[PDB]
Amino acid sequence: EDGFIADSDIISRSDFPKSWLWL
Amino acid sequence: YSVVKNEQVEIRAILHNYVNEDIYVRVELLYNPAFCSASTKGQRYRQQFPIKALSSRAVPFVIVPLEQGLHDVEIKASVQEALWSDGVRKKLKVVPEGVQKSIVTIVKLDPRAKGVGGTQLEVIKARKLDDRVPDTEIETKIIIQGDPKDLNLDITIELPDREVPIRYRINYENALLARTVETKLNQDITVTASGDGKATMTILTFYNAQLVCNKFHLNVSVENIHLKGALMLKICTRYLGEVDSTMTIIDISMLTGFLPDAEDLTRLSKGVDRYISRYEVDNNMAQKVAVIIYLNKVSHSEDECLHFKILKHFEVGFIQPGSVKVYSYYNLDEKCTKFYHPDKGTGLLNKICIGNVCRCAGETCSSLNHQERIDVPLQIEKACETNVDYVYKTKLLRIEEQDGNDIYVMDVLEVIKQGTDENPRAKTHQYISQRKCQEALNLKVNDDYLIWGSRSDLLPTKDKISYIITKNTWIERWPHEDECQEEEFQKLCDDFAQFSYTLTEFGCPT
Amino acid sequence: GISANEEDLKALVEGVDQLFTDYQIKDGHVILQLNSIPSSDFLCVRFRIFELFEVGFLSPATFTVYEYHRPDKQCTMFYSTSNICKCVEADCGQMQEELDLTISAETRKQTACKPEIAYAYKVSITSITVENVFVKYKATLLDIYKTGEAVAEKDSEITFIKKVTCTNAELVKGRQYLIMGKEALQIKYNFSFRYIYPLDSLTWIEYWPRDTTCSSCQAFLANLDEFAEDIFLNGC
């Protein structure tokens, strides 16, 4: 343990569209 | 794209380290209740291990979805002593099995040619079905557009759905217009085309019908011989068309903390018929956690079979089942995949099932926590816990039999930590667990028990609330009032009475 | 850690009132040259400096001048810029003060017959010198117990050195100390042979006082005199 980073601090990647920024 | 309610499936994560300095890294899966997964509401399934440079490591995660619709799968992973870290929540589609199917029907609207007083009564009986699946989706789009001239159509649309029916008008201004209205229940439709012009109605309907694992026979077995720890992997398979299967693929996940025996793997690799991608070797172990095996053909004749040794590194935690997956080039939709685990026959991880309804199991059995002298402050710490929806005291009426699942029937007595159930002592409770845990729970009829679990382990039953006893639902013997006088017991009589009065009549410390 | 100010230097040389004829900033020194340093009185360079970065304890350094075609006529002198937690505690040497810790005062000086310590013995201090970091301790040698190679002459006067970075290793002038010297430096300096001992860790330090008894004093002493008689006679 203690050899890593705190889950509370790791923020998962959660946003994956395929096409965005339709402007 | 999709998996199905109550299938056992492996999802395969890859971890990439596009760096140098070889790394030690930690990969946790998360707990989500819609899943019987390697992980539990308390203990997350984690693995610590190393990866080289520019390098890559396959991590399997075995899971059975239970609730359906979209549900989140979250993996997180951090590198020992460094910045590097990453997480991923990807939503996942759980559907009811059965396949999509479309039935289109098309009525003509021509009040001048068909209707009575320029008024045409068209009805469409709910199209017969039932190659269907019960309580499944059903999507009907209803779709009118006028035919081009001078048309004028008043049009009515009625369904049991609601009383206030829809009404459209069509003329030369919008003849060519999208007149769509949809409903998610097939039922008698009632179009009333009163007018003059012509118009096209298309009722388009959708629903799921149906008639896993063909193409290949596939046994997979595994078990010990002694050297860090060891066991043997054996894979059996056979196409069944009229002729040898061309160019097939064998797909393997390693049980957690396991690696293929360099020697043996090499012994298979030698062939004008079997090929294994190059692979790192250290201490006689191959660094694939996922070994694919490309062979040139496979009989429809005799069970073609092979085998290799698999070794351990760290005994860590639960040992996640392993996948084996056969698939032919000419058939890459081959869903012929099967699991293995030393002490799990099928290899399918533990779950409890009643009807359609499924729920977790811990896999590891659940012993009735026994303890003679109770630390009231501590005990109240335990039972006063984020993940504990309720604490009842409760007398165990019947013990019954249902599909290898014992239902210990409970009636609730005192309500210590008030549940979510507006009123537990009211309607009886059903505490269910597999036969396997019979002796280690060791319940008895007519005894009282402090029980306290989590809402997580509820199981939607037909007007009776049931839970499943987990490596997380805690039960204990509440010595009866008579038993009170006794020596074995006076003490418990006390500890309880005091813990009880305390919790039931004041919140949680912090 | 102290960088000079090249610019101040420049002017001392470039101008046609040139005081010198070439300043070089070289790997730590500010090497100037010029035609003649006078004798009728002095001659004086001067220039700004700053803290390139924070240093600890900075050992002071050298200033030195000499004739090009006769370095034989040097003259060097040290100097510094301004005199005088756990890491700070460099492991140099270690005294241990509390007269009579019983843990130790009575333990076998099994450390003494340990092959490492060559020279252990009682002696009192006499002189405390300190120049240019040097902290030297002219001690007069009493009760020897164990002689190694370089046999202290009993009557002669040893020297103990350790510099001001150390704080345990601080002795009382004229206060009798047992010491357990693990480092020797026998220097046949022609006339005779004086040894200089250093003052390392793994070394030992302890004290009893003289002049007259002192109540709690005769407790420790019991042990000192004890192990003394023991090993001198022969504990080994």
Partner: protein
């Protein structure tokens, strides 16, 4: 000492980074951050942020014990990769000086006033000596009455210092030619170029 360092970030927005330095036998570190894991000995993980298009700063407070101990792997990981920058630290005693009037001309068959076949170079520890600071002695044998020079023109390959008086004057640049030259005037005038196997 307090080693200063600076991390620059040239890129668009902001960027975070770790700077950990490997410790070495002879350099107390002040923290027990030694943390060895999977074969690796390094410092705790900082975790600094550096502003967009800017620069952040870095310090390591350290002090050495072994005289002249060297070399420090200094690493920086960033959302892009790892840099191992390698330094070497230099460490030193306190007031230096070198006696050397030692030497001999050995000549067996007494071709020069006398035969000379032996010489002892005693071991003189100079009294004011700094403590725990090995007395260092450099030995040199060489070929002819001219050897040392030869060996100095060919050796280390540089127009060596072969003296010690600061580069200042012109005389100094001229000296830069003296060894080369006399080695030549010898090498050629005696006719000796065979000497080099090369």
């Amino acid at each position: 000492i307090q080693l200063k360092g600076t991390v620059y970030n040239y890129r668009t927005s902001g960027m975070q980074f770790c700077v950990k330095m490997s410790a070495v036998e002879g350099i107390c570190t002040s923290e027990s951050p030694v943390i060895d894991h999977q074969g690796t000995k390094s410092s705790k993980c900082v975790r600094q942020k550096v502003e967009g298009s800017s620069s952040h700063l870095v310090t390591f407070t350290v002090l050495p014990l072994e005289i002249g101990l060297h070399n420090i792997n200094f690493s920086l990981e960033t959302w892009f990769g790892k840099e191992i920058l390698v330094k070497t630290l230099r460490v030193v005693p306190e007031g230096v000086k070198r006696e050397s009037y030692s030497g001999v001309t050995l000549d067996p068959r007494g071709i020069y006033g006398t035969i000379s076949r032996r010489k002892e170079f005693p071991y003189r520890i100079p009294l004011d000596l700094v403590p725990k600071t090995e007395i260092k002695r450099i030995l040199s044998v060489k070929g002819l009455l001219v050897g040392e020079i030869l060996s100095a023109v060919l050796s280390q390959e540089g127009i060596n210092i072969l003296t010690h008086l600061p580069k200042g004057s012109a005389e100094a640049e001229l000296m830069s030619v003296v060894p080369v030259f006399y080695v030549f005037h010898y090498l050629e005038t005696g006719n000796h170029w065979n000497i080099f196997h090369s």
